[PDB]
Design a protein around this ligand. Structure first.
Ligand SMILES: Nc1nc2c(ncn2[C@@H]2O[C@H](COP(=O)(O)O)[C@@H](O)[C@H]2O)c(=O)[nH]1
Ligand SMILES: Nc1nc2c(ncn2[C@@H]2O[C@H](COP(=O)(O)O)[C@@H](O)[C@H]2O)c(=O)[nH]1
Ligand SMILES: Nc1nc2c(ncn2[C@@H]2O[C@H](COP(=O)(O)O)[C@@H](O)[C@H]2O)c(=O)[nH]1
Ligand SMILES: Nc1nc2c(ncn2[C@@H]2O[C@H](COP(=O)(O)O)[C@@H](O)[C@H]2O)c(=O)[nH]1
Ligand SMILES: Nc1nc2c(ncn2[C@@H]2O[C@H](COP(=O)(O)O)[C@@H](O)[C@H]2O)c(=O)[nH]1
Ligand SMILES: Nc1nc2c(ncn2[C@@H]2O[C@H](COP(=O)(O)O)[C@@H](O)[C@H]2O)c(=O)[nH]1
Lengths: 206, 206, 206, 206, 206, 206
């Protein structure tokens, strides 16, 4: 019937976006999808329009805030980002789970708006590695990294507001962790009661 | 700090006890254990005292009901079975998760008594196979099987009271399912907040 | 020496094409490949020429039927589709297994033509979910879905003609199932007798 | 309805019995079991009566050959071994797959008697390791090992009579191989047509 | 030809013995085995002679120190423990890897004596859980636990002397870690050069 | 701090490049990356500039040899290939492991230059399959294949210079093998001592 919203947040460099992406590779569109956000920030190298993000002017965005197009929006690390209402509501009507790769501010917003949403915070094994991971993928640059690490602390302090916590120490353990959370929620009685309406009905008979 | 109670019920022959047993083989005593019940029913062949059950006279049991020794007890399939208070409370104090292999009546009891308990009902792919599985393990005999199948229907109708549902169609898929439920609960914020008190504290600092 | 043909069919929306695709991601070109079909039907959004299909006019196709270019061809869901002879025969000469994503009509054709071919039918857990999966991937549209579901029944009734059956209840269980069928066929004596000609010869000696 | 017989043979020391044993650890009695043979040979250390074998006098056995108690029997490595009819036929009636840990002579016997049986030969990566494995498990002794290696060659030459071949190079790859063969046979149309009679019937309806 | 010694040490309660035991369950005797130590300490409940340990008087042991029977021996947590020479040397001659569940003192001893030995230290995620694990398995008692935790610090400070480190945060991640170390060492050129002498020779020919 | 260089070589057609590629799919850029080489050889079909290779004229390359741009370079199978210094040194500074898909000549070069580098040779199960794999992926053509097989022997004779050996008999076993080698090296004390500096410090305290 209705699918489930999965908020996922982390200090930049924890590897959250790379986890969510590896997960969807093993997950068909009919079960799981991700929301593509709008944002003012400049496209990094080898980042196409309409896949990772929808890239729009600070002008275009201030007007989306106005036309009320966003389920949530916020300022993080000096730029505007947002999750458009139209897309999300459609996909969720079709029983498909949708992932939101958003910050703590966005998460707080979605939690009032959509109270059945589930949220996962991902932590690094140390701030020393948070910095190392950032430099290690050639996406981002010197100025931008120091900016993000200043807030890395403040980001991580919101961890307790989330339903689930993953320490991404080692990428493959972490991906299993995330796969599991999804798998286990799909074994909850509400959801399994629909998907096996078929079976149950015949079981209870002769 | 405190561990979690996992009620697991199923129509006889669904393979619930064999799943719980395979799970504990891959799970150390310090993380996971199972409660050993008392019961009037006669020991099957190759079933030792003090491992699968505590075998006691209908006399001995009527007195345990009296001395109030049980967290829960009930009549199922013509015999008395029970979960002793003393054992459970001890093990749970030590942060260890404990499994209860009990019927629907027992589950309803534990749910009022211990409201944070989680419960899993396991269903077979059909009643035709429920019977086949019963005959297929040489435990049980002709009389006893027909008795149990009469109630198999009534057992399965309580499935909706549980938090999680597993269709044990194929044993190894089912065991993963159960392993997962446990794994995912241990990723919930409450529990992960203790076990990583260490880490969190240092993360939020310099 | 010679590779094996794997026919795979299913009511539209069962997730057969998405399974076959996930399988090939973990399977090198020298062991496993898929046939690319020709078809009159219009390309869906984000579907390139020469990868998913070869898109040709109803004109171009009627002439391929004439020049006898197809190992098999048929009318399904209002359009023409076909598997070209030239491509298949080449790849199979090189010991590589080839997958055919074709309907029941096509399967019956290949079975007379190529009797050692193995066939797998994939079923959904219910027709209620068959429809849900179709709407859930944004490929296809309103008109087209109702058309396909009318025949979903008739499609599924041919299941018994196939060598293997998979109930795609949960995508990842299903992908293991399919991976397994391939793996197990490669453990058959005929095939293993070539690939270990080396070893066997020395074993039987001193 | 009816289960399947799995003959498994190998030159002594290939690790066939240890594979079959590890497999059953992950396989419930209602799906999979193993036949316990009778034999004249002396019990090794830490080998109990009635689990690995039924240990009987050369006298007791010559009489079983007479009373026709065996589905198959033979002389291998200087002793008599046998698979009793009574046990096998029972277990197979209940839909449970049964494994036969028997030699080539026994396999040839069962193949005429029970033509739907499936057979797996397991080979070592070299005869140099066959000897090493034999000495490496403290079961067996000096005299006995040299005796068995003389026939190791002759044993391995019957490999081509079997349906499936496994090269047990590395134990865990080999165990997956064997698990797979079983899994894939249970996905064959005959067997899956019973176990999902339920589902199929409803699929083909409205 | 010759097998490899695997020293494994940890502060009591880290779960090292339970890991080593789960590992051997998936590992045949011809590839992997564990040394059974002698010790003065009293047998815990449900601990048999000759499996976990060889239980001997302080008298019997002082004489083994004298007759020089031990490859290594030491005083840990108020008792004497030791690894007997005779057993180890035998098993290693047969190409089988042997595990030593010993303390830091023992490890230092074996490292001079047997320089190709590999060593793994296992750490807990915190000392708070080290204590929790100890109480959580009903083996050990109040007095004994506080004694061990006093030295838990001193034990863990020797971690840097070992070749490999595992943080046993979550039992199943840890068991994979250990399985891996073994697997990877068996892929080293020295060892793989013997086990595939066969193959290599033929590869390099025509 | 500093990452590790992984040389990987094999006779053409062994499947080494396809393994390395499947590995990186499950490995984030912050942990693992691959070096992109320069080469004179002509781009095969469906091979883009700047991903598989940097395609340059025999002219452009002779000048790179001159300007000393390469960590290593060599002539293999009638063409020039090379690993540029600039790229490698950067990525390794950031703690990321880098893979080098290079021949034996290149490997010998890197081993003097960078002595902590680890090297893996991959062998096919036979030369008969080496040829089959080459023809089986439509990359390469008739002339080119016979040329490479002549040297396949000479390539494989350098196997003993490497630290680790993989027999790529079956692709998925082989990929696990390679994943493992990486995983196990990251469990070595040197590397784990940095990545858990955090944890260790607190463990050794109260
Ligand atoms: N609130 C909000 N945050 C997002 C959105 N999309 C990405 N961000 C957040 O912005 C931060 C930086 O994103 P990045 O610059 O790496 O793309 C991350 O913490 C990410 O979760 C969005 O649509 N809304
Ligand atoms: N209420 C309750 N049910 C149990 C207990 N132990 C086993 N039973 C239940 O009794 C039924 C039959 O158990 P069995 O005869 O197979 O051992 C099962 O459904 C099982 O869950 C118990 O201690 N209390
Ligand atoms: N006979 C035949 N059927 C195919 C071929 N290619 C795809 N189809 C079948 O046509 C149906 C719909 O395909 P679709 O429109 O989703 O691409 C599916 O059942 C699919 O198996 C083909 O080349 N020949
Ligand atoms: N024919 C036959 N062979 C068996 C039987 N049980 C074990 N053997 C075979 O005898 C050989 C040696 O058995 P072992 O001495 O190791 O127990 C093995 O190849 C094994 O397959 C049996 O019941 N019948
Ligand atoms: N040196 C040495 N230590 C061992 C031996 N066997 C067990 N111990 C060590 O003694 C400590 C406590 O063992 P436990 O009392 O738990 O059996 C552990 O750290 C364990 O590694 C041994 O044979 N020699
Ligand atoms: N020395 C060296 N060999 C490489 C380099 N890149 C690829 N080659 C090697 O050249 C051989 C053929 O490469 P291919 O033609 O298949 O791309 C392979 O053995 C491969 O390892 C390189 O940069 N340096």
């Amino acid at each position: 019937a209705q699918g489930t919203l999965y908020i996922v947040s982390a200090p930049s460099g924890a590897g959250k976006s790379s986890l969510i992406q590896a997960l969807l590779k093993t997950q068909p569109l009919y079960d799981t999808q991700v929301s593509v956000s709008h944002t003012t920030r400049q496209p990094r190298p080898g980042e196409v329009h309409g896949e990772h993000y929808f890239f729009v002017n600070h002008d275009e965005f201030k007007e989306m805030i106005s036309r009320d197009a966003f389920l949530e929006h916020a300022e993080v690390f000096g730029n505007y980002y947002g999750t458009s209402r139209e897309a999300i509501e459609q996909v969720l009507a079709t029983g498909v789970d949708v992932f939101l790769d958003i910050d703590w501010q966005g998460a707080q917003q979605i939690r009032q708006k959509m109270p059945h949403a589930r949220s996962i915070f991902i932590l690094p094994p140390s701030k020393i590695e948070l910095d190392r991971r950032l430099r290690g993928r050639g996406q981002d640059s010197e100025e931008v990294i120091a900016k993000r690490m200043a807030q890395a602390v403040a980001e991580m302090s919101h961890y307790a507001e989330y339903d689930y916590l993953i320490v991404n120490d080692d990428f493959d353990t972490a991906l299993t962790d995330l796969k599991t959370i999804i798998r286990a929620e799909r074994l909850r009685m509400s959801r399994q009661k629909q998907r096996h309406d078929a079976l149950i009905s015949k079981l209870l008979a002769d």
